Design an enzyme around this catalytic site. Structure first.
Site, PDB file in Angstrom:
ATOM      1  N   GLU A 155       0.943  -1.066  -0.110  1.00 22.48           N
ATOM      2  CA  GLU A 155       0.022  -0.073   0.075  1.00 22.48           C
ATOM      3  C   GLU A 155       0.902   1.328   0.076  1.00 22.48           C
ATOM      4  OE1 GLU A 155      -3.119  -0.364   2.808  1.00 22.48           O
ATOM      5  OE2 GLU A 155      -4.042  -1.984   1.848  1.00 22.48           O
TER       6      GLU A 155
ATOM      7  N   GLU B 175      -4.279  -9.034  -0.774  1.00 22.29           N
ATOM      8  CA  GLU B 175      -4.787  -8.728   0.612  1.00 22.29           C
ATOM      9  C   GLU B 175      -6.320  -8.322   0.755  1.00 22.29           C
ATOM     10  OE1 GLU B 175      -2.146  -6.240   3.073  1.00 22.29           O
ATOM     11  OE2 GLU B 175      -4.304  -5.436   4.152  1.00 22.29           O
TER      12      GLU B 175
ATOM     13  N   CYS C 188      -9.434  -8.504   4.269  1.00 24.51           N
ATOM     14  CA  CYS C 188     -10.088  -8.987   5.386  1.00 24.51           C
ATOM     15  C   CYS C 188     -11.207  -7.900   5.857  1.00 24.51           C
ATOM     16  CB  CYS C 188      -9.046  -8.795   6.656  1.00 24.51           C
ATOM     17  SG  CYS C 188      -8.433  -7.192   6.937  1.00 24.51           S
TER      18      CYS C 188
ATOM     19  N   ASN D 222     -13.444 -11.111  -8.822  1.00 25.40           N
ATOM     20  CA  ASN D 222     -11.824 -10.888  -9.299  1.00 25.40           C
ATOM     21  C   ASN D 222     -11.562 -12.073 -10.242  1.00 25.40           C
ATOM     22  OD1 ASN D 222      -9.686  -9.064  -7.586  1.00 25.40           O
ATOM     23  ND2 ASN D 222     -11.609  -9.665  -6.173  1.00 25.40           N
TER      24      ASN D 222
HETATM   25  C1  LIG Z   1      -3.935  -3.738   4.143  1.00 25.60           C
HETATM   26  C2  LIG Z   1      -2.672  -3.481   5.175  1.00 25.60           C
HETATM   27  O1  LIG Z   1      -1.422  -3.664   4.507  1.00 25.60           O
HETATM   28  C3  LIG Z   1      -2.663  -4.307   6.898  1.00 25.60           C
HETATM   29  O2  LIG Z   1      -1.434  -3.777   7.266  1.00 25.60           O
HETATM   30  C4  LIG Z   1      -3.859  -3.799   7.310  1.00 25.60           C
HETATM   31  O3  LIG Z   1      -4.122  -4.448   8.804  1.00 25.60           O
HETATM   32  C5  LIG Z   1      -5.202  -4.173   6.551  1.00 25.60           C
HETATM   33  C6  LIG Z   1      -6.562  -4.187   7.467  1.00 25.60           C
HETATM   34  N1  LIG Z   1      -6.769  -3.056   8.018  1.00 25.60           N
HETATM   35  C7  LIG Z   1      -6.937  -1.675   8.191  1.00 25.60           C
HETATM   36  C8  LIG Z   1      -6.997  -1.059   9.294  1.00 25.60           C
HETATM   37  C9  LIG Z   1      -7.264   0.555   9.730  1.00 25.60           C
HETATM   38  N2  LIG Z   1      -7.240   1.245   8.539  1.00 25.60           N
HETATM   39  C10 LIG Z   1      -6.579   2.473   8.499  1.00 25.60           C
HETATM   40  C11 LIG Z   1      -6.652   3.233   7.173  1.00 25.60           C
HETATM   41  O4  LIG Z   1      -6.015   2.682   9.489  1.00 25.60           O
HETATM   42  N3  LIG Z   1      -6.953  -2.093  10.238  1.00 25.60           N
HETATM   43  N4  LIG Z   1      -6.721  -3.384   9.509  1.00 25.60           N
HETATM   44  C12 LIG Z   1      -4.884  -3.314   5.223  1.00 25.60           C
HETATM   45  N5  LIG Z   1      -5.020  -1.860   5.325  1.00 25.60           N
HETATM   46  C13 LIG Z   1      -6.021  -1.308   4.385  1.00 25.60           C
HETATM   47  C14 LIG Z   1      -6.237   0.342   4.648  1.00 25.60           C
HETATM   48  C15 LIG Z   1      -6.987   0.805   3.654  1.00 25.60           C
HETATM   49  C16 LIG Z   1      -7.533   2.213   3.935  1.00 25.60           C
HETATM   50  C17 LIG Z   1      -8.134   2.967   2.586  1.00 25.60           C
HETATM   51  C18 LIG Z   1      -8.376   4.356   3.001  1.00 25.60           C
END
Ligand SMILES: *[C@@H]1[C@H](O)[C@@H](O)[C@H](O)[C@@H](Cn2cc(CNC(C)=O)nn2)[C@H]1NCCCCCC
Ligand SMILES: *[C@@H]1O[C@H](CO)[C@@H](O[C@@H]2O[C@H](CO)[C@@H](O[C@@H]3O[C@H](CO[C@H]4O[C@H](CO)[C@@H](O)[C@H](O)[C@@H]4O)[C@@H](O)[C@H](O)[C@@H]3O)[C@H](O)[C@H]2NC(C)=O)[C@H](O)[C@H]1NC(C)=O
Ligand SMILES: *[C@@H]1O[C@H](CO)[C@@H](O)[C@H](O)[C@H]1NC(C)=O
Ligand SMILES: *[C@@H]1O[C@H](CO)[C@@H](O)[C@H](O)[C@H]1NC(C)=O
Length: 497
Positions: free
Chosen positions: A235, A340, A342, A370
């Protein structure tokens, strides 16, 4: 071979309960005899890949829904399915008794389980870690003489990956992704916040960060682990955001293009790891096709990029056709890969909903959409979390197909586990998506694949409350008369000769 022990936690469906002495199991997959089809059914009501068999009929008459297989209409080949061996996942798994650990690992990696062939491996710490670290925290170590794997790798992740590979009958592909560089390579000198590599692609900072990738693959290679692929950064859009809460490293698409062209591409290509694939983006599909345009219209970047990794978190704002479809059209020889996903990460989502059928349907709907838009594989996040959806050093709790309850030496296999399994168990690497056309508008999600041996695999998800009777036509073989119950997922298998 062993049925689900169901438990309700007050949500739409049941979890299956496992411990040191019991876990539900499946048989290794097999095709039935020519002229017969197999149906694996999961339901909100509590069926868990229940096997029924039916005859293939020479003829069909009626006005009901017909799904016609287009076996000679060929799309993408499948790389596979799996999940992330985070620090959090490793800690949760190893907190179980050794017998319970083996039943959890078999659930994912055995042919008695759902036959995962992909493990995503964070390069040092992310949010799903209990401490912040990189492989090279000694300041200004541009030589990376103090690069080393801590216990999170040598004691937790690597031994678990060896145990998974030992259980796996299929070849397993490891995928590496970094969250943050050492802070002394960063403009902001912190693991989190808005911050990129200091300087510009081609310079000492970028050359050192590229060499960190090789040091990581070397260190895993010393531990007898080889990678299929790495991503350019997890990301990269995240590190462009003021106050970003956890480990990140900001790249604009132009920054990623030039880093790949000048540093990461050449460094990997001039190493023993030259066969390891490089995937760009590893971020939300809302960034496509723009990110793909910026990187891949530069031939010096393009020559190093195998594929485009996508995350699912903005799918609800990013129609597949305008993102995945348009990217495939522009760059048809550059594979798309979902790296990724969840549930529970969003403001409006509860972290963990034990037994949630909705969350299962989210997984299968995503995998189908997908697959229908050229994506070659799909990767879960944490393989296992605790009932809070952790641990996580920024208390960023989410859901996982397996929830560990360490006080009861128990783990819970959720709907998500079975929904993912409806694909992973029955779609080996090298399977090819083929056409499947509906006779009329319908509420079903469905995808057809041709198994390497030429046999058919069809997954049918019904996210509606209504039972849908339907027929599947295989023009060479005959007709499957079946029914898609409300809130069900089916996998159909049949031989074609
Ligand atoms: C993918 C990321 O690589 C991983 O570290 C993370 O745990 C995933 C899920 N996720 C997001 C969050 C809180 N989100 C933020 C923005 O703080 N808690 N678990 C995932 N991260 C996705 C972020 C997408 C945000 C889009 C605006
Ligand atoms: C690991 O989990 C296992 C399953 O949760 C545990 O085994 C179970 O232990 C409970 C409590 O002693 C038993 O429950 C009782 O259930 C019986 C009914 O038995 C049988 O019928 C059930 C229900 O359909 C079926 O699943 C079983 O196969 C049996 O044939 C009742 O008569 C009692 O009143 C009471 O409710 C379970 O029978 C038992 N299940 C199994 C599959 O063995 C085990 O204890 C756990 N291990 C640890 C270390 O905790
Ligand atoms: C199927 O349909 C054809 C074409 O009408 C018919 O002639 C044939 O007898 C039918 N065969 C079977 C096995 O029902
Ligand atoms: C870093 O590596 C060098 C060379 O091996 C060593 O002499 C030095 O003491 C190390 N520094 C730390 C902090 O471990």
């Amino acid at each position: 071979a062993r049925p689900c022990i169901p438990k309700s936690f007050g949500y739409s469906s049941v979890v299956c309960v496992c411990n040191a002495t019991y876990c539900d199991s499946f048989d290794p997959p097999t095709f039935p005899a020519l002229g017969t089809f197999s149906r694996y059914e999961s339901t909100r009501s509590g069926r868990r890949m229940e096997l029924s068999m039916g005859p293939i009929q020479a003829n069909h008459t009626g006005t009901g829904l017909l799904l016609t297989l287009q076996p000679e209409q060929k799309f993408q080949k499948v790389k596979g399915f799996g999940g992330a061996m985070t620090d959090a996942a490793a800690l949760n798994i190893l907190a179980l008794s050794p017998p319970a650990q083996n039943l959890l690992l078999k659930s994912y990696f055995s042919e008695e389980g759902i036959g995962y062939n992909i493990i995503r491996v964070p390069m040092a710490s992310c949010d799903f870690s209990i401490r912040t670290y990189t492989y090279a925290d000694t300041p200004d170590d541009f030589q990376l003489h103090n690069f080393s794997l801590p216990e999170e790798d040598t004691k937790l992740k690597i031994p678990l990956i060896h145990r998974a590979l030992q259980l796996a009958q299929r070849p397993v592909s490891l995928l590496a992704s970094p969250w943050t560089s050492p802070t002394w390579l960063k403009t902001n000198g912190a693991v989190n916040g808005k911050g990129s590599l200091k300087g510009q692609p081609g310079d000492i900072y970028h050359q050192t960060w590229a060499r960190y990738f090789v040091k990581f693959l070397d260190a895993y290679a010393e531990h007898k682990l080889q990678f299929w692929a790495v991503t350019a950064e997890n990301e990269p859009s995240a590190g462009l955001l003021s106050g970003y809460p956890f480990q990140c490293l900001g790249f604009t698409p132009e920054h990623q293009r030039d880093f790949i062209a000048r540093d990461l591409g050449p460094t990997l290509a001039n190493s023993t790891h030259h066969n390891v694939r490089l995937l760009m983006l590893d971020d939300q599909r809302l960034l496509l096709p723009h990110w793909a345009k910026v990187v891949l219209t530069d031939p010096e970047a393009a020559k190093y990029v195998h594929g485009i990794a996508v995350h699912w978190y903005l799918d609800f704002l990013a129609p597949a056709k305008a993102t995945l479809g348009e990217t495939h059209r522009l760059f048809p020889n550059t594979m798309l890969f979902a790296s990724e996903a969840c549930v529970g990460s969003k403001f409006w989502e509860q972290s963990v909903r034990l037994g949630s059928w909705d969350r299962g349907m989210q997984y299968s709907h995503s995998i189908i959409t997908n697959l229908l838009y050229h994506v070659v594989g799909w990767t879960d996040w944490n393989l296992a979390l605790n009932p809070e959806g952790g641990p996580n050093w920024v208390r960023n709790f989410v859901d996982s197909p397996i929830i560990v309850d360490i006080t009861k030496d128990t783990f819970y296999k959720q709907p998500m586990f079975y929904h993912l399994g409806h694909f992973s168990k029955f779609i080996p690497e090298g399977s090819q998506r083929v056409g499947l056309v509906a006779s009329q508008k319908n509420d079903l999600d469905a995808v057809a694949l041709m198994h390497p041996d030429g046999s058919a695999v069809v997954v049918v998800l019904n996210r509606s409350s209504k039972d849908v009777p339907l027929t599947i036509k295989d023009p060479a073989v005959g007709f499957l008369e079946t029914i898609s119950p409300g809130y069900s997922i089916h996998t159909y298998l049949w031989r074609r000769q």
